[PDB]
A paper describes a structure:
Poxviruses are large DNA viruses which replicate exclusively in the cytosol, and encode poxvirus immune nucleases (poxins) to degrade 2′3′-cGAMP and prevent STING activation. While baculovirus and lepidopteran poxin homologs share <25% identity with VACV poxin, they are functional nucleases and retain 2′3′-cGAMP-specific cleavage activity. New poxin structures include the alphabaculovirus Autographa californica nucleopolyhedrovirus (AcNPV) poxin from Group 2, lepidopteran host poxins from the moth Trichoplusia ni and the monarch butterfly Danaus plexippus in Group 3, and the betabaculovirus Pieris rapae granulovirus (PrGV) poxin from Group 4. In spite of dramatic sequence divergence, poxin structures from each group reveal a shared core fold and head-to-tail dimeric architecture confirming poxins as a single enzyme family.
Group two primarily contains poxins encoded in alphabaculovirus genomes. The new poxin structures trap a post-reaction state following 2′3′-cGAMP cleavage and allow direct comparison with the catalytic mechanism of VACV poxin. Strikingly, despite sharing <21% identity, each poxin structure contorts 2′3′-cGAMP in an identical strained conformation. Consistent with specificity for 2′3′-cGAMP and a shared mechanism of catalysis, the active-site charge landscape is conserved across all poxin proteins, with hydrophobic pockets for the bases, and multiple basic residues stabilizing the negatively charged phosphates of the 2′3′-cGAMP ligand. Unlike the catalytic triad of histidine, tyrosine, and lysine residues essential for VACV and AcNPV poxin cleavage activity, the active sites of T. ni poxin and PrGV poxin are divergent. Interestingly, mammalian and insect viral poxins from VACV and AcNPV exhibit similar kinetics, with a KM of 0.83 µM and 2.43 µM respectively, while the T. ni host poxin protein has a KM two orders of magnitude higher at 342.1 µM. Consistent with our enzyme kinetics results, inactive VACV and AcNPV poxin exhibited a KD of 0.58 µM and 0.81 µM respectively, within a similar range as the respective KM values of wild-type enzymes. Comparison of lepidopteran poxins with viral poxins from AcNPV and VACV reveals greater degeneration in the protease domain and protease active-site pocket in viral enzymes that results in loss of C-terminal coordination.
Author numbering:
A (entry chain A): 0 to 233
B (entry chain B): 1 to 193, 197 to 232
Write the structure that this text describes.
Amino acid sequence: SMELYNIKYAIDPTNKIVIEQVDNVDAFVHILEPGQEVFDETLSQYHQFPGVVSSIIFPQLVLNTIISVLSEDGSLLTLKLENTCFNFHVCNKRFVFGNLPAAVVNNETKQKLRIGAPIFAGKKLVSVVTAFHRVGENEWLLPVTGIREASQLSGHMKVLNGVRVEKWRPNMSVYGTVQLPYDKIKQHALEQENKTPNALESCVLFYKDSEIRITYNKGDYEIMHLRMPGPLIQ
Amino acid sequence: MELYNIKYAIDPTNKIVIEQVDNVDAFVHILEPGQEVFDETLSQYHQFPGVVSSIIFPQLVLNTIISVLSEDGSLLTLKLENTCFNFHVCNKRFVFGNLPAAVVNNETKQKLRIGAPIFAGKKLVSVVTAFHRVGENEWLLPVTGIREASQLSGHMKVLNGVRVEKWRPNMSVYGTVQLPYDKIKQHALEQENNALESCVLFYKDSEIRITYNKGDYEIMHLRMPGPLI
Ligand SMILES: Nc1nc(=O)c2ncn([C@@H]3O[C@H](CO)[C@@H](O)[C@H]3OP(=O)(O)OC[C@H]3O[C@@H](n4cnc5c(N)ncnc54)[C@H](O)[C@@H]3OP(=O)(O)O)c2[nH]1
Ligand SMILES: Nc1nc(=O)c2ncn([C@@H]3O[C@H](CO)[C@@H](O)[C@H]3OP(=O)(O)OC[C@H]3O[C@@H](n4cnc5c(N)ncnc54)[C@H](O)[C@@H]3OP(=O)(O)O)c2[nH]1
């Protein structure tokens, strides 16, 4: 396999980078698609950050520092972590999510990047390419997943029935499983008790370009409501 | 008294009472950091960390300038350059978030009453709710309101309050416990769901963690910036 800085890597039949070793120690780095749900009990022993199951810790970065990514041309591309991006997956009924530091690339640059391309800070691996989010014409967001950046948020929650993602419509407030006008949500919230017959647990993610809402519910009763920056990677 | 678009008074506890905003009768009730209250009359109003309010405290932008009413009636101009985490519990509802904050010294903090109206563009946008000591002569002043675009807010129903715990140096967090990573990892893979619901907030100077649990089983784990007030 090929060696670069402190890693060894290979390439998938799906044109995806496979991280084989880091610091001369055998490694496991498994990339998940945005919002993908998988079930595989073998994955729970490893670390998880949004979009990756990894045997190696992807360490905390700082916004506005410079990282390097391996390009399809064997070169290193230097990028500044100027934006943020929200990504998630579901692995063994655990919703793993967070807002990640992100770089910005044009159409030409994105296509030179493989899903899995190692990302370096200094000459040490700090992350891998996991996803691309289109932020308009000739512009993409490149999240750098890993341990929560100091100013950001990360987390997980057990979701028995997955994560149902819903487009967040204009003029709607959010309670539990519904988005409705505020005056209605205010009446509904003060109305709801934890008494839904045959109440199943739910997790809902509502999204607009700027903001994400996550609720955790038992039946129609809202247990948690979290508001956080966007955007979401489809 | 009047100032800009508000009318205000003073409490027996030296706390500012907002009486009307835009000539409409107002209700602004300031809660202490982490305070738990129960009063069914509060649930009809808006709630942002540290305040129950009949008026919306709108979204602000970090690094913009706000003005605060001083004890002497003058306006002090401050820049929203920092953040800090605050919360309360009202009617078994944990209301929390990271708020934009200014930095003040001892002399300035002492000129500020809890409840002091905060203005942006000659309009009320918030009230003084809390002070968090940074150092000897340094304080953080949260400006509560609708979540700033880059930060987080939320709520959750907590039947048994919020347990606040100091977060120890080398400990990872699962559910109700903080333990070394190797045990937390095994414990997490151990859990499966007379189990009571729980909410725990572990705090460090830089970072805060909230867990929501059913007995010993962790349902949710949130990591977010600190500090806590
Ligand atoms: N993944 C991750 N994202 C972050 O943003 C982050 N910020 C700090 N840290 C800490 O750095 C070390 C990372 O290894 C840990 O000390 C971790 O502290 P913690 O975040 O306090 O510990 C909870 C552990 O416990 C893990 N688990 C929790 N529940 C489960 C579960 N059901 N199944 C499998 N693992 C579970 C949980 O994912 C996790 O461990 P992992 O790193 O292995 O992911 C982070 N970790
Ligand atoms: N409080 C608050 N903090 C923020 O950071 C924020 N960012 C946007 N918004 C929206 O701005 C308008 C402000 O009113 C609302 O449209 C709100 O949309 P939403 O945040 O999507 O709606 C859920 C409603 O519903 C309220 N409820 C939810 N549960 C309860 C409950 N048990 N009892 C009483 N009220 C409950 C919940 O507090 C809430 O209403 P409040 O405005 O009063 O805060 C925010 N609101």
